[PDB]
Amino acid sequence: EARRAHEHLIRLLLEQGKCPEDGWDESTLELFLHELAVMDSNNFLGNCGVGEREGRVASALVARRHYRFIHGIGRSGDISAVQPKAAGSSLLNKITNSLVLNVIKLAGVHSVASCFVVPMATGMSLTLCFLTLRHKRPKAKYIIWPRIDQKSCFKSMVTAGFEPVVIENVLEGDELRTDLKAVEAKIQELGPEHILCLHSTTACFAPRVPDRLEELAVICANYDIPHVVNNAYGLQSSKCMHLIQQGARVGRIDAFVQSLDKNFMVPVGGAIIAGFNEPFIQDISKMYPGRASASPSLDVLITLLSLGCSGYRKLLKERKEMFVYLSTQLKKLAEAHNERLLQTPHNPISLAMTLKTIDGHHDKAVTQLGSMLFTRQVSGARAVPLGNVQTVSGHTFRGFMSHADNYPCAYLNAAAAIGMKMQDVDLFIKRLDKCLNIVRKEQTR
Amino acid sequence: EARRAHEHLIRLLLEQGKCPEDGWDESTLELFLHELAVMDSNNFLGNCGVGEREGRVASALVARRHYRFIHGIGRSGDISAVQPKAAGSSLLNKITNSLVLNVIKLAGVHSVASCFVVPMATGMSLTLCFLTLRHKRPKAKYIIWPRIDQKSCFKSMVTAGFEPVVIENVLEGDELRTDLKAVEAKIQELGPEHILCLHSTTACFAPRVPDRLEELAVICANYDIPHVVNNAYGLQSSKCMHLIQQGARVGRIDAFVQSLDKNFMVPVGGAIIAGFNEPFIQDISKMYPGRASASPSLDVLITLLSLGCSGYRKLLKERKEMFVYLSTQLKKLAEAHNERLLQTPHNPISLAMTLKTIDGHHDKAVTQLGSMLFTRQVSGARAVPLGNVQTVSGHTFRGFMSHADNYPCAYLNAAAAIGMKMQDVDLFIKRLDKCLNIVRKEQTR
Amino acid sequence: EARRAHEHLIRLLLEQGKCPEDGWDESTLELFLHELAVMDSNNFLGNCGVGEREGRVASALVARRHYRFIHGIGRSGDISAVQPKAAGSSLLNKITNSLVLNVIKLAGVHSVASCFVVPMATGMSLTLCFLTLRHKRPKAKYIIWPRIDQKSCFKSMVTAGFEPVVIENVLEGDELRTDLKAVEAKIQELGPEHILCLHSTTACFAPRVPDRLEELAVICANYDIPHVVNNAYGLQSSKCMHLIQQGARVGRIDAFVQSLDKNFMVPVGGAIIAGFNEPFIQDISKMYPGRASASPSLDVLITLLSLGCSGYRKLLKERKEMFVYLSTQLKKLAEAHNERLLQTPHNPISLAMTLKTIDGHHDKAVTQLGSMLFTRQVSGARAVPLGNVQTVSGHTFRGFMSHADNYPCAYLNAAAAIGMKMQDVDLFIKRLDKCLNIVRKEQTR
Amino acid sequence: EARRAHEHLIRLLLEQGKCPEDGWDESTLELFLHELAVMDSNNFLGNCGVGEREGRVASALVARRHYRFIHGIGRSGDISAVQPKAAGSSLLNKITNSLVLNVIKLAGVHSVASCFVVPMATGMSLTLCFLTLRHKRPKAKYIIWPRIDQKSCFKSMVTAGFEPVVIENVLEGDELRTDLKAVEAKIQELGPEHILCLHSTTACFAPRVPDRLEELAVICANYDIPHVVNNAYGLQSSKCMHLIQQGARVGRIDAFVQSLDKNFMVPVGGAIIAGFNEPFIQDISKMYPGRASASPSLDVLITLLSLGCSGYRKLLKERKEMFVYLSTQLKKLAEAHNERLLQTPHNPISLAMTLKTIDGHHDKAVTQLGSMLFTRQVSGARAVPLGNVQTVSGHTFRGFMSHADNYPCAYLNAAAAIGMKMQDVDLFIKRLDKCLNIVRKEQTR
Ligand SMILES: [Cl-]
Ligand SMILES: [Cl-]
Ligand SMILES: [Cl-]
Ligand SMILES: [Cl-]
């Protein structure tokens, strides 16, 4: 029978909480979602509501677009608690968290113990980790942070009410890498007890590379200092994930956070907080005040059930292939223009070519190139000039955008992130070739 | 011409940022949304993306349900900043914030200066206010809080890293009201400089009533202490809103926060932070780290454009009418069962009847009644027994659920919140009548 | 339990095939439709297809918009037969036909024996009746037809391959009515055996009125001639339906046909063929070659389940009320302009006011008025001048649009059909007032 | 600019009425459809309606699923006429007909002069052709028809009111082919003037093959007899289409009809009537009484714009590839079971393997095999036994399902039609292997 076949897949999902190997048909998925929504009290035929939060909906467009899931996730006192007024939404949350734990394993952190989706972006999710740690370490005021010029993760420390201690990176060839000795020197200077945590970063803009997590995990273990990893867009990278797995095996990592949109191709606004100590990850979840949106969870649930394990693995494989293609094409273009691809082997996602030939003419040509690319409908390229000075949440960054005060040259940043197509690379190369030719003609003529 | 008529309404909205008096047809709304989504770079026909956040979407179900709005709101460094990669989503955010400012005025706070939608629930939004105030008042550690037994707003203070100072309420007739003298005694005891803010509450469970905001505003003004108002579900009440307006006219109110779901009949997960000092409200917004979901904003935009000013006013009028109906019906039922409606004239939304006839038999009958109602598909009723002891985020509440250590009696709580129908009251009354008869027969026989 | 409540309604529908008294929630309806679609073999998870009609769909937009119902209705040899490849679509067809039989009863023909939805408009559905009758009456060549100036029902006879015999109407006061003596004179002239059927009409443009069905039913009974009734938009009228019921009680009516769009507020393209002799109605159905669209059936099923019996009755009641309102408003406007409402008491839907004051100036003012109304976004008004000559499918109509060669005056036609709102009448009156004033000023100045 | 890019594609479509080479994004398509729907008067903001057909819609689900296209296609007197009440739907119809003419050319009939979509299935569409020809040839009573055991196309002649003259096929090797001499003998016997048309068939169940259209076109040309081609599922086949093109070049073909679902992967219920003489094809269109559904047209429009020319060509290519794969796999399976693939080179879509090893045991094993396949979720396979006698619309077919009285053996029919996947063939082969093994074990043990 037809219905029994659909029921079989749903039962499989419910029993073991795992991603199906092959993606579900839309028919099975929508049957499932409708069944779940039926379980929420706001959708009961015989329901009457006499409270202030009854999940009433004014607009049919709003009700339909959310599959009639209105109550959000959690209870008033606990985002992790089953909501008796919303049994279907509760199940939705539970299954989604289980699917995500599974995917974290698949992606390369096979020892992850606990995780939960939180409907806040990565910056605010990092903030939530810091807020949790306040209560564990009431003497702490500082967060030690190897520099990365990204405003959200920087602001996350300030928003939490802590003082970032910015550790400058070491130039090693073309790469900017973790200054482990500076990290330790700051721990000793300020005192371990006064450090809330070390806040490290994996996926990042080239020529920075993922932090030396193994060595940082050892430092944190030895000094008894929490270690929080900003894995914003590292889940899509087996290299980044293995770094986290290794870190956890050789030392201390207390939490790692990743963006839903950047790793699962869904709207901005959700993140996953994960870790190796279940009580601690639970403590972070319990720190969340109030109910929360179910919308990011629904998105990732729809996405993972539709892809299956095989679909997601395929996307990860294709990203690695696109990285190789992007790198080859960009090196070819760069060398044709008397530039070079910066040697950034430790960065698995992000690449950079030099812009030495247009820089140094005192005409803002690097910044102009970024503008020209943007007007030609290239998005996500970063034209990084030298000498930017910017103050962000109380800290003045010299060489802002380059993750160092004195990076040797201007460069252009491109990346092969999940869901990239050959057309993205090909149009980019074609448009970049044209823009470079235009700038050089202007500077020459 | 047909298209020109639609364009006229869209232009009207764009020019003045105001709610249309009459609600838009679905056709106009969906034309508008599709036009806006077209403006986001991820939807450009000629686009190529070479970044880590390109708003790529894997599932067509996910893309469609969000009207192809994928980039969220804000920039990395600023949730209020226009996003050049998402011009349509930026406009969506700007218009939604303008519509909401207008509705706040319509609802009764005609002097509101600034507001923004934040895709977090009210608890976390209150937390964000406290996080902002940390930086203004680095010596402060305490938040003075007139007691209300609601876990989210309580946890919001703890999550922010502050010590709540719980002020017990005064029993005045049947009502529990603000103890102004206790509030002042604590300010003097602890020192104004050590108070982060006063955290007051408007809409609440009867027999508590909205806080004495005028008097609290004077205290805060005189002692130079910020005043943050938890208006979670008070926007739907002209009485609550006038209280805020009056508070701002006679003294100090720095921010007031309200729930999107509870006041606009949309999914849980969004809130509005509003105030009278634009730079300060802007400072709260700037404290948010990273981009955020556009989903709550889209929901309220769809809802407000569909209702128009007239539709929303109608809902507010109907809520007042349902309150009268609920009150009359509940008083009639109560008196028929030898109970009474508690005299709570200062509470415009929430009502309570006594449960003296089933209480005191040492059989947990009050709690049982709540269970019986729930199993009969009544949601949102609160059966409040005497003597609950509960510890929540480090504070032990005696008489938990009753907002006092020693409320004189057990009671049942019902409310007339926005979107309530006659059927809600009628089914509630019928089912409650039956449950009371059952409990009394059990206790009698 | 939640799901059981939905199942109860679905089981009720399936058991007795009747319209629910109250309309289903959207949630129940969409649960039902998804369940039905699951039953169609094209939606089976384990299906493989090796035929030329597998219900494959290329576009997801197409699949979704039709709720994954792709196989249509019927088998190759029989539109009424259960389709083993599409059990869900078969059930959809069966239930829809049962719901429609019920509604025909509700609407006033309580003795209807059999009916089926056919995904053709009324003209083609009338054609199908005539095609069926060919085989019953191989000697017949003529269809006797009391005149109505509507091209579809006229063409239906020609398309079927028969010669219409146009019977002119009798002017009785302001009304144009059936010439019973002319009908009989033609039967005698041509011979009963050479008449395929009498083709009568109920709902029609004023000042024509529904045909004298009782008397025509007697004539047909006595002469042994089939009687086919064009009830295109008469189902919405209890007066029209009672006329059919009475006709069937006092004489012969073999089939009556009505438009889905005009009576159920759904897209154009479907009709219902109904009758009192089940074998004969079955014979009409069996005359249909091939499978047919399920789209009109799905539309009416969604519509009737959503309205319930009460919702549909309400619409019928509201139409009667709008007719009274339209009549009162139009009479008032007419008399204000020195015109009058034509006395057409036997027409329950359509009304006419005279246009004597603008007619007769040799300037095409009547036709101009129709154009002016149209440009001011009034649709469905008919400005009928005198003296139109038009040849339609071989027949030359003098006085075309007026259903007579020599109607005494020009007039404007307005109607109160199902789903009309007060705004329709009010805007119409306002716009008509303005247009008349403009024409008269032009003719005066 | 973003919107301009979408406008460019829409303008391209509107100017030349041609299929885009590459498929449109969903965003462009839905922008277009919404723009078109805005043009229909029922969707005008300032509209008032005072007629009986105002395109009012009761259910929001119905309105939305049809993109607010409610008025259907055509005017009362003409399905081809622009509808002033529905300018958007009129444009929708015009563009769809233009796209389809283009695709007919692409598919292999490059000299097609005129075509139109009709929202009836192929049987009824054939009927419409015959109904048109009645008026051209009032002396005609017979339709000469080379036998094919398919009930719809057979019934189409009877429904139109004509006597089919069934011409038996010639067994040539394994193939059943047109008996040209029998066709001519009947023309001479009955008289050319008494023949309404020759009704030939292209795509068909093996071991029948497409009719000898070149030779039939010559016969029709010479005898002055219309030629109507049932191309139900031949459009997807360049072999079938070239046969039609050749027929038109060497003789007479007046019309050819094809199924929307079978060739374009959309719901059942639509067809395309096409021809080489524009006035005649126009005459067929004009024979349609009344307005008609726009739903099939919308489906094919969405489908063709989404695929583009390249997407449709790809599907045609893939069908040829799947035919080769199906043939190879079926021959391999057949020979493994001591059966053979019937030699049917002139049939490009449909294949047959012998069932001699299970036939002849007087146990209905062939029919049982068809049942067993069906219960194992194989659809579209035809198990054809010998000796079926069936009367269909007055004609008794001996050997029914085999297109001959005395086909030499029982066989199983499988086909590679458009949209077939490797999984369809692979599951079919696996399941067929199992079923054959089961039947043979039963017959052996
Ligand atoms: Cl990697
Ligand atoms: Cl109020
Ligand atoms: Cl009536
Ligand atoms: Cl072919």
Curated annotation (Swiss-Prot), chains A, B, C, D:
Enzyme Commission (EC) number: 2.9.1.2
Ligand binding (tRNA): R249, R376, K441
Gene Ontology terms, MF aspect: O-phosphoseryl-tRNA(Sec) selenium transferase activity; tRNA binding
Q: What is its main location?
A: cytoplasm
Determine the domain of life of the protein's source: Eukaryota
Q: Which UniProt keywords apply?
A: Cytoplasm, Phosphoprotein, Protein biosynthesis, Pyridoxal phosphate, RNA-binding, Selenium, Transferase, tRNA-binding
Q: Which GO annotations describe the biological process of this protein?
A: conversion of seryl-tRNAsec to selenocys-tRNAsec; selenocysteine incorporation
Gene3D superfamilies on file: Type I PLP-dependent aspartate aminotransferase-like (Major domain)
User: Under which pathway is this protein filed?
Assistant: Aminoacyl-tRNA biosynthesis; selenocysteinyl-tRNA(Sec) biosynthesis; selenocysteinyl-tRNA(Sec) from L-seryl-tRNA(Sec) (archaeal/eukaryal route): step 2/2
Q: Tell where it localizes.
A: Cytoplasm
Q: What is the effect of changing Q83E?
A: 50% of wild-type activity
Q: What does this protein do?
A: Converts O-phosphoseryl-tRNA(Sec) to selenocysteinyl-tRNA(Sec) required for selenoprotein biosynthesis.
Q: What is this protein called?
A: O-phosphoseryl-tRNA(Sec) selenium transferase
Q: Which organism is it from?
A: Mus musculus
Q: Which gene encodes it?
A: Sepsecs
